[PDB]
Motif scaffolding. Sequence first.
Motif, PDB file in Angstrom:
ATOM      1  N   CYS A 225       0.714  -1.309   0.173  1.00 53.42           N
ATOM      2  CA  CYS A 225       0.053   0.210   0.049  1.00 53.42           C
ATOM      3  C   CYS A 225       0.771   1.160   0.111  1.00 53.42           C
ATOM      4  O   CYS A 225       2.107   1.350   0.598  1.00 53.42           O
ATOM      5  CB  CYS A 225      -0.993  -0.114   1.183  1.00 53.42           C
TER       6      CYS A 225
ATOM      7  N   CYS B  61      -0.358   3.220   4.157  1.00 56.74           N
ATOM      8  CA  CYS B  61      -0.107   2.213   5.561  1.00 56.74           C
ATOM      9  C   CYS B  61       1.067   1.268   5.264  1.00 56.74           C
ATOM     10  O   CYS B  61       1.485   0.840   6.184  1.00 56.74           O
ATOM     11  CB  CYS B  61      -1.220   1.466   5.629  1.00 56.74           C
TER      12      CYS B  61
ATOM     13  N   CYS C 290      -7.088  -0.801  -0.964  1.00 52.45           N
ATOM     14  CA  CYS C 290      -6.366  -1.336   0.227  1.00 52.45           C
ATOM     15  C   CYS C 290      -7.559  -1.506   1.040  1.00 52.45           C
ATOM     16  O   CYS C 290      -8.100  -0.910   1.685  1.00 52.45           O
ATOM     17  CB  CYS C 290      -5.430  -0.629   0.680  1.00 52.45           C
TER      18      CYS C 290
ATOM     19  N   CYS D  15      -6.901   0.088   4.826  1.00 49.30           N
ATOM     20  CA  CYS D  15      -7.216   1.557   5.113  1.00 49.30           C
ATOM     21  C   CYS D  15      -7.721   2.322   3.783  1.00 49.30           C
ATOM     22  O   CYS D  15      -7.976   3.452   3.685  1.00 49.30           O
ATOM     23  CB  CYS D  15      -5.730   2.053   5.343  1.00 49.30           C
TER      24      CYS D  15
ATOM     25  N   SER E 282      -6.569   2.829   0.700  1.00 48.42           N
ATOM     26  CA  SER E 282      -6.051   3.685  -0.236  1.00 48.42           C
ATOM     27  C   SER E 282      -6.225   3.226  -1.704  1.00 48.42           C
ATOM     28  O   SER E 282      -6.094   1.745  -1.998  1.00 48.42           O
ATOM     29  CB  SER E 282      -4.555   3.744   0.401  1.00 48.42           C
TER      30      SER E 282
HETATM   31 ZN   LIG Z   1      -3.134   0.845   3.197  1.00 45.37          ZN
END
Ligand SMILES: [Zn+2]
Lengths: 55, 152, 65, 94, 280, 48, 258
Positions: F7, F10, F26, F29, F31
């Motif tokens: 990622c 993170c 992701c 989180c 993303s």
């Molecule tokens: Zn992430």
Amino acid sequence: FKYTRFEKARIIGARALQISMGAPVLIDVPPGITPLEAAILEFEKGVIPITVIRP
Amino acid sequence: PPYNADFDGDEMNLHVPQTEEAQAEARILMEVQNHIISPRYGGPIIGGIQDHISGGYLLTREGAYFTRDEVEQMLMFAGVDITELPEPDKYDENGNPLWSGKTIFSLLLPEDLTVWYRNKLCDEPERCEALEKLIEEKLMPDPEEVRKLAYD
Amino acid sequence: MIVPVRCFTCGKVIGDKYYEFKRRVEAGEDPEKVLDDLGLERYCCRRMLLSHVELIDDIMHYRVY
Amino acid sequence: MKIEVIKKEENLLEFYLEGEDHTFANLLVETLRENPHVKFTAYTIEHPITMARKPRFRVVTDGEITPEEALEEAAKKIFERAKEVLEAWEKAVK
Amino acid sequence: DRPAGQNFVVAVLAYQGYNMEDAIIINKASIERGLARSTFFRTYEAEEKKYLGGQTDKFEIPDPTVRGYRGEKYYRNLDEDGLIFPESKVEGKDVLVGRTSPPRERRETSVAVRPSEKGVVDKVIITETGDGTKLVKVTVRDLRIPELGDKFASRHGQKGVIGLIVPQEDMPWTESGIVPDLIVNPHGIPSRMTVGQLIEAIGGKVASLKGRRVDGTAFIGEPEEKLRKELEELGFKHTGREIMYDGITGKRLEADIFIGVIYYQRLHHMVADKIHARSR
Amino acid sequence: VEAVYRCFKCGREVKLDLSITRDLRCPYCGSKILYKPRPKVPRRVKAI
Amino acid sequence: GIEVQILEKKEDSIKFVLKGVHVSFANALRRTILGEVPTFAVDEVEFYENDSALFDEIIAHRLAMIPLTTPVDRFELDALELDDYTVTLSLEAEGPGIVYSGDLKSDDPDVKPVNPNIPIVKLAEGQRLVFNAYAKLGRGKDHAKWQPGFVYYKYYTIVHISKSIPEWKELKKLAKKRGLPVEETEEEVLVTTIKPFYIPKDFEEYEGKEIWEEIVPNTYIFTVETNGELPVEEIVSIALKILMRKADRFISELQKLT
Ligand SMILES: [Zn+2]
Ligand SMILES: [Mg+2]
Ligand SMILES: [Zn+2]
């Protein structure tokens, strides 16, 4: 009679072209040289068949 | 000078002629040797620029002498074909031979060149007048007399 | 970005003396005396320690994997 | 190190010395120059990039001794001087 | 906090005529030890563009049967998914993203590096555009050690390309042991009237010796006479000149050579980007 | 074939396939940006 | 005759006076020391993982710049064809902190970094760095990383300051402050320039006529510094051996020609 530098350039070009095409060299030359310096040496020795025509 | 180029990022192009006629034309008509004299004003256009003048002045400056090592090294570096040094001019205090810059420069000129003129360093016209008087009077004064009347 | 290992001009190793110099100068000592103590007499070496920037900390925070 | 002869006339010798540079060439010519029988001697590097490690020499004698003899004598003198300096340095360091 | 350039030990002197007409001479060993070394980045972008009617391009290693398929050599660094591995050495005309588009069978539309570039893949990111299409970016880094033709310029408008890289043992040295990292031609000063350059050289010498930087803030800066006095007090000639020995002959130069420390910055007009030749 | 990715934000480990995934994400989180990690093979660099 | 006198000797530099030899020989010795004496140095690096903020080329160059101890007895350092013996150095570190040159592990105990406090790179939390570095002999003329140290010389000169110059006591005190040896005669004071002695501005007008410098023929003040790769006294010996071997090789080649 004196060769103008344009006439000399044209003579050298024609002679070099003829030598490259397969014409024999009228003088002995060192090995491993291009037709151009062959023609230049031919001119320097004064052995030139080509002649110019002036009006 | 003829190209009007400075080495501060300037770029240049080159073209390679292919046919024999073009090559002969370039070799005979367009070589750098034939274009020393400028067509514009009839004078040279190829020559020294910055170091070739200042270093020449340093070499030919009045009172400049060189040792044997420097003479041999500079002659070999310049490519001048020599195999025996000329007679030394003036001896060093401890006995080493010395050569004035003027003779070293004269080793480059042809064997029959002869000329005289006034350069840009002429600041005492009386000495130039005396030298011109002598030269015009004789046209070939004995080189000993010129030495006493020498002036840069 | 980190301190050079060797002086550019003369090749003397000065990589390990930077932190010592910085800490001593921050304490208020005379920089000239500190440099003389460390053993850098030629100014070519002194320039490397005097004009250096520690950007490794600034550029360390962004990672690429 | 390998000598390549360019021209070998009488009392004259011009050769390349491939594999060397100013370090040995200058030493050799300066050792030669103190020989009274050498009329002219010098070295040069024709181009700093292409001929960086291929000096060019020119040695001319007065005919009393061939140039090869002069070169051998100069090299021998260099060897003797280096050995003497080494012995002096070894003595002085202790 | 974000500087740009390095301090050079510069000696004003003519050397072998290789620095005439604004060219400069740089020391080889200094270049080896890290002086003026830089890196060049470039980013390539490839998008999985969807077309009308549902046909879309696809990221994969192209089969040898597709139209426009280059030689198998150029795909040696590609993973299965059509994305090049990071930190893999790459050269000119090598592909970075393998992409095939629908015909206008399928034709190759892969993205490849520029023909006259080289380097190492540094970073590969995959993401989605503003309309849901996949998007990748590849960054290629290249190490560029200084070489003949690279452009250098000082802060006083004195530019030039390096004309010769000379080994350290041929560089002249000073009685104090200083070996210049850069030699400039004296002929460039009088015609340009950059006295600030000489004053900065003296100031850099003084700052290095004294241990603190020197203020040069325009009109309220440190006067040059004070710098000369300080330099004289520190054990050097007040004119900034020193006795140097010739690198080759080993003898002593007849004149006293001006030498000091001058800030120099390397411009991005580097020869590796200018040169290109056309055959047909 | 399934591949490995990391990622952007993170820095965690995310596994998915581009040819099938219609929405890059992701899961930890959210993303939308991912990195391609360095392969674990030795590479030679000249110290010159 | 040839003779050598030691002036001072620190633990990493030596200053001596060489007398009775020509300028060309001194220059040749300096050049051979600068770029002919061989040393060990990192040549090729094989990274396995590098998560640092620095590129692989930067770390490789920094490794190359690190000085390495070089054994003297085992290898024929004065030979004209160095052998291809290779020493492998490895490193495996991670986590927060700074990677120092002392963390390098060498398979050969005889070759190891001289200074264990040189920083290589800073690693943040979680970043890892693993590689193997290969070292081999080389010469300073091929790359500056193989240079054994720094060396320079200067003319051995004596400065004559006439007593007729007013305020010559100031000049004498200045010379003493610089640290140069100084002695006084009845008419002038003699200063030996072990280090450069530059005349102040206000005394320039007396140069040449009242303050003149005498050059002692065939006498040079050398100065050799080392980074710990070799003992400071072994460098000169190795250089002289190299000069002798080159002379012998040239003799052999010249004899072969004839
Ligand atoms: Zn992430
Ligand atoms: Mg321009
Ligand atoms: Zn230094």
